[PDB]
Design a protein around this ligand. Structure first.
Ligand SMILES: O=[N+]([O-])c1ccc(O)cc1
Length: 295
């Protein structure tokens, strides 16, 4: 891997964003980190009421105005915001030459499951209501948002809603029990995700519901009929086997799934694209994948 990976690993081993002692300190810690990445002057952000879910349109100069990614941020269903993920949103908008709708879906523990999925599906249905075409759309998300991407597609399909052209999962979180082999075998190389913070956030999201509830933990969902799916994941990830098991389940359900394991990469390494060459390379690949499925 690039020497820059050492810099990112050193930052994460000190900031320990998922190990802050309170939910408000976890939220503030991630906001402080995101404030570091310099936002380009050519990014246009427009606040919108996305059918009762707060959102922001993210547009860059070469955004095709009729192509839309609904972007679902990570943060364990507990942290993250429009502010934390607007940089990753604008990088995807640039690579995919599209607009991004970045939504502020309801967070736990204040709003447990299924609030996040009610909000993601509402925002998608609002895009259709306001004239977006499914063949020009995609859903994408990182970590918890990657799991929410799969759950959103399942819920839309089950409601007879037309599905988008493609979807993208970045280090998705789909096993709320942390029972993948890599949760043990990659614990020594993952500077961000470990089983204890995973179970802490799962508890807040589930609020005592079965941890295999399919729309919370889409490892257990019916994935038949989903559109083409890109899963990007790092091999230095306790969540590696979330992606491997998701790929297995989606392929068994007849889905056109691309599993891309990036050697030595850490959790949502794409977020560090300002400094990490592999982050920008991975975002360029997301853009290629989306443009291919919109052709
Ligand atoms: O970044 N995230 O969304 C997360 C946080 C904790 C976890 O166990 C899995 C994913």
């Amino acid at each position: 891997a690039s020497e820059a990976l050492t810099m990112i690993v050193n930052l994460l081993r000190s900031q320990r964003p998922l190990q802050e002692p309170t939910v408000e300190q976890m939220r503030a810690g991630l906001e402080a980190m995101a404030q570091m990445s310099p936002l380009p002057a050519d990014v246009e952000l427009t606040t919108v009421d996305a059918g009762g879910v707060p959102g922001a349109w993210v547009r860059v100069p070469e955004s095709d105005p009729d192509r839309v990614v609904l972007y679902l941020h990570g943060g364990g269903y507990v942290i993250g915001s429009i502010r934390t993920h607007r940089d990753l949103a604008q990088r995807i908008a640039r690579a995919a030459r599209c607009r991004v709708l970045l939504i502020d879906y309801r967070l736990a523990p204040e709003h447990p499951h299924p609030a996040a999925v009610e909000d993601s599906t509402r925002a998608y249905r609002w895009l259709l209501e306001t004239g977006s075409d499914p063949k020009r759309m995609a859903i994408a998300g990182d970590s918890a948002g990657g799991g929410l991407t799969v759950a959103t597609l399942v819920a839309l399909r089950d409601a007879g809603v037309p599905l988008p052209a493609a979807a993208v999962c970045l280090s998705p979180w789909v096993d709320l029990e942390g029972i993948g082999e890599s949760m043990t075998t990659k614990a020594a190389v993952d500077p961000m995700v470990q089983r204890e913070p995973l179970l802490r956030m799962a508890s807040m999201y589930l609020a005592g519901q079965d941890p295999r509830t399919p729309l919370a933990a889409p490892l257990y969902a019916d994935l038949r009929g989903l559109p083409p799916l890109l899963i990007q994941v790092g091999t230095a990830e306790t969540l590696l086997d979330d992606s491997v098991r998701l790929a297995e389940r989606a392929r068994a359900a007849g889905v056109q799934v691309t599993l891309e394991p990036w050697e030595d990469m850490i959790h949502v390494w794409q977020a560090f694209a300002a400094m990490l060459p592999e982050g920008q390379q991975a975002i360029e690949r997301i853009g290629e994948f989306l443009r291919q499925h919109w052709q």
